[PDB]
A paper describes a structure:
RmlA, a glucose-1-phosphate thymidylyltransferase, is the first enzyme in the pathway and catalyses the condensation of Glu-1-P with deoxythymidine triphosphate (dTTP) to give dTDP-d-glucose. In addition to the active site where catalysis of this reaction occurs, RmlA has an allosteric site that is important for its function. RmlA exists as a dimer of dimers and is functional as a tetramer. As a consequence of its structure, the active sites cluster at the dimer-dimer interface and the allosteric (or regulatory) sites cluster at the monomer–monomer interface within each dimer.
There was a risk that the more extended and flexible alkyl chains in 1d and 1e may undergo hydrophobic collapse. Therefore a heteroaromatic ring was incorporated into the linker unit in an attempt to minimse the chances of this occurring. The triazole-containing compound 1f was therefore synthesized. In the case of 1f, the para-Br in the N1-benzyl moiety was also removed to provide additional room for the triazole group in 1f to adjust its position in the allosteric site. Whilst there was a notable decrease in the potency of the triazole-containing analogue 1f in the RmlA inhibition assay compared to 1c, 1d and 1e (entry 6 vs. entries 2, 4 and 5), 1f was still able to inhibit P.aeruginosa RmlA. The structure of the RmlA-1f complex [PDB 6 T37] revealed that the triazole moiety of 1f stacks between the imidazole ring of His119 and its own benzyl group in the N1 position forming an unusual sandwich structure in which the extended C6 chain in 1f is stabilized. The terminal NH2 in 1f does not appear to interact with any protein residues and extends out of the pocket. Superposition of the structures of the RmlA-8a with RmlA-1f complexes revealed that the introduction of the triazole moiety in 1f forces the repositioning of its N1- benzyl group. Compared to the situation with 8a, the N1- benzyl group in 1f is positioned much closer to Arg 259 and Glu 255 which form the backbone of the hydrophobic pocket. This may be one factor in explaining the observed drop in potency associated with 1f.
Numbering used by the authors:
A (entry chain A), C (entry chain A): 2 to 192, 196 to 293
B (entry chain B), D (entry chain B): 3 to 192, 195 to 293
Write the structure that this text describes.
Amino acid sequence: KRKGIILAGGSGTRLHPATLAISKQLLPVYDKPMIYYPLSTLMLAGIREILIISTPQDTPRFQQLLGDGSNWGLDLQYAVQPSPDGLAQAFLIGESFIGNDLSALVLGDNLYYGHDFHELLGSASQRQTGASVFAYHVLDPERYGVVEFDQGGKAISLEEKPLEPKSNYAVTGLYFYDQQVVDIARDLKPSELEITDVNRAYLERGQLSVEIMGRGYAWLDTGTHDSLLEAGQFIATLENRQGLKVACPEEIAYRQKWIDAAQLEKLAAPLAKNGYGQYLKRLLTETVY
Amino acid sequence: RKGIILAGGSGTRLHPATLAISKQLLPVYDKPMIYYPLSTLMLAGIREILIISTPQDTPRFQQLLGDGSNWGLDLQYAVQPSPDGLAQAFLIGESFIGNDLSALVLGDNLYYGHDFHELLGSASQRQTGASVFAYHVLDPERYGVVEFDQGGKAISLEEKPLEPKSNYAVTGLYFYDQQVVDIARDLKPSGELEITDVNRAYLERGQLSVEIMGRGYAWLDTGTHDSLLEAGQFIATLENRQGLKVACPEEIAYRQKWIDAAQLEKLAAPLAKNGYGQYLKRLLTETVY
Amino acid sequence: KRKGIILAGGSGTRLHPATLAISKQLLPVYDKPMIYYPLSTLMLAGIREILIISTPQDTPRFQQLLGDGSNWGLDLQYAVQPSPDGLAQAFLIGESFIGNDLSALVLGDNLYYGHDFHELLGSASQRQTGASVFAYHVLDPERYGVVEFDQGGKAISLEEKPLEPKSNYAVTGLYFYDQQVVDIARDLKPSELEITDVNRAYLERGQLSVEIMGRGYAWLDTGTHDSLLEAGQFIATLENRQGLKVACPEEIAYRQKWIDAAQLEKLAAPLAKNGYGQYLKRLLTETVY
Amino acid sequence: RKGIILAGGSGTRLHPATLAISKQLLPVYDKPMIYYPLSTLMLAGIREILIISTPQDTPRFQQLLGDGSNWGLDLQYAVQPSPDGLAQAFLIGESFIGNDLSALVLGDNLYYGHDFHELLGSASQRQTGASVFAYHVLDPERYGVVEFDQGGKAISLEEKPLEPKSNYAVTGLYFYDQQVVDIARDLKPSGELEITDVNRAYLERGQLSVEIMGRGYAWLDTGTHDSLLEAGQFIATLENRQGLKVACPEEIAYRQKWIDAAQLEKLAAPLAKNGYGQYLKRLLTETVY
Ligand SMILES: CN(c1c(NCCCn2cc(CN)nn2)n(Cc2ccccc2)c(=O)[nH]c1=O)S(=O)(=O)c1ccccc1
Ligand SMILES: CN(c1c(NCCCn2cc(CN)nn2)n(Cc2ccccc2)c(=O)[nH]c1=O)S(=O)(=O)c1ccccc1
Ligand SMILES: CN(c1c(NCCCn2cc(CN)nn2)n(Cc2ccccc2)c(=O)[nH]c1=O)S(=O)(=O)c1ccccc1
Ligand SMILES: CN(c1c(NCCCn2cc(CN)nn2)n(Cc2ccccc2)c(=O)[nH]c1=O)S(=O)(=O)c1ccccc1
Ligand SMILES: [Cl-]
Ligand SMILES: [Cl-]
Ligand SMILES: [Cl-]
Ligand SMILES: [Cl-]
Ligand SMILES: [Cl-]
Ligand SMILES: [Cl-]
C-alpha cells in the first residue's frame, strides 16, 4: 500500500498579485484547476489514499473543490501548513496519515504528460525499499535540485539550486519513499527543511533510484506568469487536437475501474451544459485505446 | 459619477476551473481579472466604486482590494444572491447610487488602446441619457447587437439574436444618468433582468448614445477557456514588449495624483521581491509619456 | 533497405496569401523549416535515402536548404509534382527512386513528438511485408482517413474524410510500404489518386498493420493558420523548457553516428552566432540520456 | 511623399528558418510579413513605393506584389547586394526618390492602434525636416535610443547603447524631406551606414521631430523566433475577436478608394475558397465604422 501527499502550500508572495485572492494550485491550467494535474499523476500511479497539504486559509477551497474523494473512488484527507518551512515538512505534517506505509510526494504545481508515463510511475511504485526520483533535462537547472552522473550513468551527487550546475538534469516534483522517510525528515536541520537533504540521505545509504524522464515527456513549469500561460497553451493544443483531456480525474478513476458507468454518469449530470460534462458523457459510449 | 463592477457568478459555464473561486479573481497574466475593469473605471476618473459579487466571494474581493483607501479610492461591497441578470446591479446598487450619475463595467471585460481615456471621457461628460460602445465582433449572436440605419444612427438592440442585424456588439461598459434605477425597477424577467432592456428603454426615449469603439481598440473575450488564455497571451505580449503594465491600479492612482510618491513607495515595499513591486519602484524615478 | 519519400507539394491556395511567396513546408515551425520535422521522423526510423517531392517552382528552395544531404550523412534526391493529383502520385513520381526496395512516405507538414517514438517507427520499419500506418484519436476525424475497429480492436474499414466518422481515429501522414505499393498505385483510378485507396488495397489483402499512436504522443496539425501557430508555440514551450531541440536533423544524424564530432563542429561554425549553432556546439560536450 | 520598404537580409540571425527565404516573406499569422509595413505606408496615403530586398528574393517580392496596379499602387523594386546598414536605402533609392519627400519603413515592423492614421498624418504633413516615433520598450539597448530633457525635448540619439539613457526606442518608421539622400551620401560606415546617424544629422540641425508612440499602440518585435510567434498570436487574437483583418492591403486600397467594388470583387475571385477571399467578398456588402 502506497499513500499520496500533494503539497499545495501556495507560493508565498512570488506570483502576487495574481495569487493574492487564491492559492497558485487552485488557478486553472486551461480548463481545470492546477491541482487536478498532480492528483491525476498520483491516480495514474494507482494511489487512492491522498493527503492534501495547503494553507489554513485555502484548505476549505481545496475541500469545496475535491471533497473526501469518494465521488472519484479516492479517500482525500486535508492538513494545513501554517508556515512554508520547506517541502520536507510534508512528512512531519503527514506523519500520522503515512503511519507505517510507503508514500509518494507530488508538488501541487507540477504537470506531467507523455507515453508510458504509467510505466515510469509503475517502476518507482514497485520499488518497496529506498527512494525513487526522476531526472529531466531543463534549460535552467540552477532553479532545481540537480543530479550529477558518473561516466557509467550512476547518480553520485545532488545539489539544491547550485549556481554552477554539474548537469542539466533537474529532480522533478515527484518523489517515491519507503517507511524511512518520516524519521529521515525528523533528523533534518533547517538550511527550510529541504527535500534535496531527504534525497541525499537516501543517496548516501545507496538507496536512491534516479530514473531519467526522457525528452519525449513534458514536465511543465508553473513557476512564473509566463510559464503558467505556456502550460495553459500546451494543454489546450493537446486537448483541442485529440478531443481527449489531460489529467481529467473522473476519466482516470473510470479507466482504473475505481468508479463505474453509473457513477460517471452522475458526475456528468451537473456539468452537462459545458464541454467538461459533455466529455464525461462521451466517455461512457466511446472506445479509447 | 459613481462606479459599479458586476463580478457575479458565470454559473457552471467555466466549471471545474471556477468551482473553487469566482472567474473575476482568476489572473489574466500577472494580475487578478478584476484589476482590468477597476483600472477602466479609474481611467474614467471614477473613485467611488461598488463591487457586486457572490455571497461566497465578497470576502475574497474585500481581502484583495480593502476599502480602496491605499489606492485613493472609496470601495464598497454588495452581494448578488443569484445571477438573475446584469440589470439587477441597479437594484442592489440603488442606495449606493443615490441621486448620482453611474457607470457599470462587467468584472470580466478587458479594454486596451490609444485615447481610451478620451472615449471614456466623452461618455462620462454626457450628464443626461445613457452611453454605450459598439465593437465589431465575429460572433455578434453571443452579445447585445446594435442595428444602424444608412446614416449610422442606432435603430434597434437585440439580446443574443439568432439572426444578428449587424456584427456590432455592445461592450460591457455602460454610462447612465439618474433614470437608470427607476428604469431597472420597472423591468420584468425575460428569467433574467436584461441590461439590453435597460439600454432599449433609453433608445426608445432617444437618450441612448452608441459610440463606435474602433478596430484599433482591443475589447477582449474572457467568456471561454480558449479566450481567457488568449487574453493572458495578449497582455503578456504588450507588457513584455513595453516594460509597462496594462491596468496596474497603483500606477493609474499615482498618475491621476490620487496617491503620492510616498504612498506608492509604501505599496511597493511588500511586493519588492517580485517584478510587480520592482515595477512600482521604477515608476517613482522614470518619466513615462 | 527502406527508402524515404517526403511529399512537400505545397497546399494549393488553401493557406493563401501566407503561402503565395513560398511553399507551406518551407514556413518555420518556431525556429526551423517545417520540412525539418518529417525529415527528422524518417531519420529516427533509420532511413538515410530520401526523395523530396515538391512543385517545380520550390524544388530549388528545398535544394538550397537541404542540399544532397551528405552534410547530415543522408542521400537526398529531388522530384517535381507538376500538379497536385493526390498523395498516391508520390509512388509513380518516386517509382525509379524506390526501385525494388521497401519505402516510407511522410507528409512534409506532419509533426510528431513523444517517448518511444523510435520504437513505434521501429515496429513498422521491421515489418518487411504489407503496409503499416498509425491511428491517432483526433477531435475532427472527418478531415482525415478514418479507421473503424471491431470489438476485438482489429481494423475492418478505412474511409477518406467521411461526413459521419465510424471512430475518432485518423490515419497520420506516415506510411510504411513493401514492394507492392508502386503496382497498387499504378492500378488506382482518380476519385486525385487517394492514399486511403492504397491503404484499403492492403487492408482487403489482409496486409495492413494499424498501430495506435497513443494520446501520450503529439501529432500536430499544420492545416490552418491557427494550428500552424499552435504548433510553433508547442515546440517553443518544449525547447525553452528542456534546452533540447525537437527534430534538429544535425543532432539526430550525430546521435545515429551518421556524422562524427568533427563533421558536427563544421556544421556549427556558420551558425555559431545564433542559438541553433550554439546548440550544435553544446551537443559535442554534453551527455544527454 | 514616396515610400520605401527595406526588406533586406537579417544575415544568419534567424537561420535555419530564414535559410530558404527572406524573413519579410514569412507569414505573420495569415499574411506575408511585408503586408504589414506595406499597409502602414498605404494608411499614411503613400501609393508610390520602392521595395528593397536581396538579389535572390526580389523576384519573390515581385511575384507576390507585382507592380501594385491591382491595389491602386505603383510598386518599383531595387536590390541590396549586401546588408551594409539601413541608411543605404537612400543611395539605392536615390533615383526613385528624385526631388520628392520620402518615408522609410522596415519590412519586419508591425504597428497597431487607434488614430494610427493621425499619427502617420502628422509626420507626413510636416514637409521640412525628419519625423520619427519613440516607443517605451523593456530592452532599449537593442535599438536607437532617444534621451529627453526635463521639458520632454529630444537631446541625444544612441545606436544600441550598452547603457541606454531612456527606455524610449526609435520605431522602424521614418519620414524625411529632400535633405535625406545628401545626408546619407556624406555618412561613413560605423561597418554599416546607420539610420541613427541620418536621424542625429537632422537632430543637430534641430530638424528632427520625435513624437511619442503611446503605450496604447502595439509596436511588435519580429527580431527573434519567440517574438515572431508572439506577433502571430497577437494578430490572430485581434482578427478572430473582431472578424476584421489587420493590414489587409486589398481592404485598405478599397477604403482609400484607390480601387472600386468591381476591382475588389476581381481580387476576391481567385481566393474565394479560403477565409481571405471570403473576407474580401464580405467587405463589398458590410458597413464597417
Ligand atoms: C495523457 N495521459 C492520460 C492517459 N493516458 C494513460 C494511458 C496509458 N495507460 C494504460 C493504463 C492501464 N493501466 N494506464 N495508463 N489516460 C488513460 C488512462 C488509461 C487507463 C488508466 C488510466 C488512464 C487518461 O485517462 N488521462 C490522461 O491524462 S498521461 O500522460 O498518462 C497523464 C498525464 C497527467 C496525469 C495523469 C496521466
Ligand atoms: C495602456 N493604458 C494605460 C495607460 N494609458 C492611458 C494614457 C492616456 N492618458 C493620458 C492621461 C493624462 N491625464 N490619462 N490617460 N496608463 C497611463 C495613464 C496616464 C495618466 C493617467 C492614467 C493612466 C496607465 O497608467 N495604465 C494603462 O494601462 S489604457 O489602454 O488606456 C487602459 C486600458 C484598460 C484599463 C486602464 C487603462
Ligand atoms: C524528442 N525526440 C528526439 C529525440 N528523442 C529520441 C530518443 C529515443 N531514442 C533512442 C534511440 C537510440 N537508437 N533513438 N531514439 N532525439 C534523441 C535521439 C537519440 C538517439 C538517436 C536519435 C535521436 C533527438 O535527437 N531529437 C528528437 O527530436 S522524438 O520525439 O523521438 C522526435 C520527434 C520528431 C522527429 C524526430 C524525433
Ligand atoms: C486596424 N487598422 C486598420 C484600419 N484602421 C484605420 C481606421 C482609422 N482610419 C479612418 C480613416 C478614414 N479616412 N482612415 N483610417 N483600417 C480601416 C481603414 C479605413 C479607412 C482607410 C484606411 C483604413 C483597415 O482597413 N485596416 C487596418 O488594419 S490600423 O491599426 O490603423 C493599421 C495598422 C497597421 C497597418 C495598417 C493599418
Ligand atoms: Cl524520451
Ligand atoms: Cl480605430
Ligand atoms: Cl521594473
Ligand atoms: Cl500513450
Ligand atoms: Cl496611448
Ligand atoms: Cl468573412
